[PDB]
Each structure stands twice: as C-alpha cells, then as structure tokens.
Ligand binder design. Structure first.
Ligand SMILES: N#Cc1c(Cl)ncnc1Nc1ccc2c(c1)CC(=O)N2
Ligand SMILES: N#Cc1c(Cl)ncnc1Nc1ccc2c(c1)CC(=O)N2
Ligand SMILES: [Cl-]
Ligand SMILES: [Cl-]
Ligand SMILES: [Cl-]
Ligand SMILES: [Cl-]
Lengths: 124, 4, 124, 4
C-alpha cells in the first residue's frame, strides 16, 4: 500500500493500556499466583504470552474472570513479567533472574527466556 | 510520520 | 530503574491485537457508522481516541455493546482510522483526506488531524 | 534488547 506510519503510535497505545490497568479500567480477569492477585486485560495477556493466548482462545476458559497459575509460579516473577507486558521494560536483576526465567518459560514469552539465558551464561 |  | 527494554515489544503487541480483531476474538463493542458496523476492542479504541476514552470511562456507556456515531461520519473515513489504531498505518489519499480529517477531529486523534492539515496545506 |  501507499500508507504513512506514525512511529510512536504502538508505544503510545501501550502507555495508555498500562494507564488503564493502573486505574483498573475495563480489566476483565484476575490472575491468581498463590496468595497474590493481579488484575489485567485478557487481550494484552494474549498478545504477550503463548500460555494466555492458548487459555483465552479456549471456548470455556475465554469466559472465566479468574485464572489460577501453577503453585510453583513466583508472584514477584509474575509481577515483573506483567509489568513488562504493559511497558516493554523488564526489571531483570541477579536476585530475580531465575524466577523471571522460570515464569517466562511457563508463560511462553520466548524473547524474555532468551535474554535470561544470555544474562545467566555471561555470569558463569 | 514516516514512509514505512 | 535499571530495566532493559525490548524494542519491538509495543509493535508486536499491536500486531497481535490486530490479529485478534481480524478473527473477532474478545471484541466487546460494535461501532455503528450509518449502514456500516465495525467490531473492536474498547481498550484499543480508548488508547487511540479522546472520544472513545471519554465514552468508555462513562459509568453508563462503559457497559454498552453498541455505539452509534454521528450520522455525518463517513464509514470509509472511520474504517481508515480504525485500521490506523490497530496498525500505526494511515491510508491517506487525495480522495479520502477530507473524510479522514473530519473523522479524526470527531474521534479526537490529534496526530492524524495534524498530518491531514499538513498534507492539505501542501496541496494549496 | 537495549538500555532504555
Ligand atoms: N493475542 C495473540 C496472538 C495471536 Cl492473535 N497470534 C499469535 N500469537 C499471539 N500471541 C502470542 C502467542 C505466542 C507467543 C506470544 C504471544 C509471545 C511468545 O513468546 N509466544
Ligand atoms: N485509554 C486511554 C487514555 C488514558 Cl488512560 N489516558 C490518556 N489518554 C487516553 N487516551 C486518549 C485520550 C485522548 C487522546 C488520545 C487517546 C489520542 C488523542 O489524540 N487524544
Ligand atoms: Cl470465573
Ligand atoms: Cl517476550
Ligand atoms: Cl448496548
Ligand atoms: Cl492519533
């Protein structure tokens, strides 16, 4: 086609989706990770994670308002990845890298798993 | 705006 | 903070949101523009348009599944802007610029209004 | 990945 493109559009959309999340506006699911709960938008979760894409395209699970993650999942690891989904920013630290990598593998977030593997290999 |  | 950032993340999220729209997955509103209907995600509309942000933060309108636009709104102009919302790509042409600019003013999409004004000024 |  002969389209023009607005460079910052995708980033601006994501910033507004994060603003809606922070204000709990039109959030439609709560992700339960042991004792912790995280409100989010199903569409954002599906757009970022192979696991959520699978869950919310399922004819029964698409209608659930609560999703319980595997008890082995670390809430802080999930929180870091949820923030990454809504911002493109990953708070990767020596103290959380193992939990972040395990959570990203479970959520099927290949690019995160990749940088975790690379950061771990550099420290060995 | 750019030509993509 | 000490975060790392994945450059293509925002663009990849938007590509997946457009894929969900094309497959009518978790779309939660129909925008009626005279004889035409457009299925979309409320969160994407709010993230792109001052008008939709206002509409879906309203305590009554947030729950509506159908939104009827002003009869003066051109369906093709709306279609072009809806595509832009989900892709960052604007199909701006001599034959549609007036309709696109009028629709962008109504939807409160300032950056689109700006490029339309600039393209019009260059042709006079 | 980059340093933002
Ligand atoms: N929503 C949506 C969606 C669609 Cl529509 N098409 C294709 N992938 C989608 N999302 C999705 C699937 C697999 C993975 C990710 C996202 C990130 C990753 O590492 N794996
Ligand atoms: N969703 C959301 C949203 C939030 Cl949360 N905060 C601030 N603006 C939001 N969206 C929105 C408001 C005004 C305009 C646009 C988008 C594009 C434009 O030209 N005007
Ligand atoms: Cl439920
Ligand atoms: Cl990822
Ligand atoms: Cl309705
Ligand atoms: Cl805009």
């Amino acid at each position: 086609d002969s389209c023009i493109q607005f460079t910052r559009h995708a980033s601006d959309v994501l910033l507004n989706l994060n603003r809606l999340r922070s204000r709990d506006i039109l959030t439609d699911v709560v992700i339960v990770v042991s004792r912790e709960q995280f409100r989010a938008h199903k569409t954002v979760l599906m757009a970022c994670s192979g696991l959520f894409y699978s869950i919310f395209t399922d004819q029964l699970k698409c209608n659930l308002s609560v999703i319980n993650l595997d008890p082995e999942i670390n809430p802080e690891g999930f929180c870091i990845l949820l923030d990454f989904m809504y911002t493109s920013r990953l708070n990767l630290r020596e103290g959380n890298i193992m939990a972040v990598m395990a959570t990203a593998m479970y959520l099927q977030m290949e690019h995160v798993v990749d940088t975790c593997r690379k950061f771990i290999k550099a420290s060995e | 705006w750019v030509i993509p």
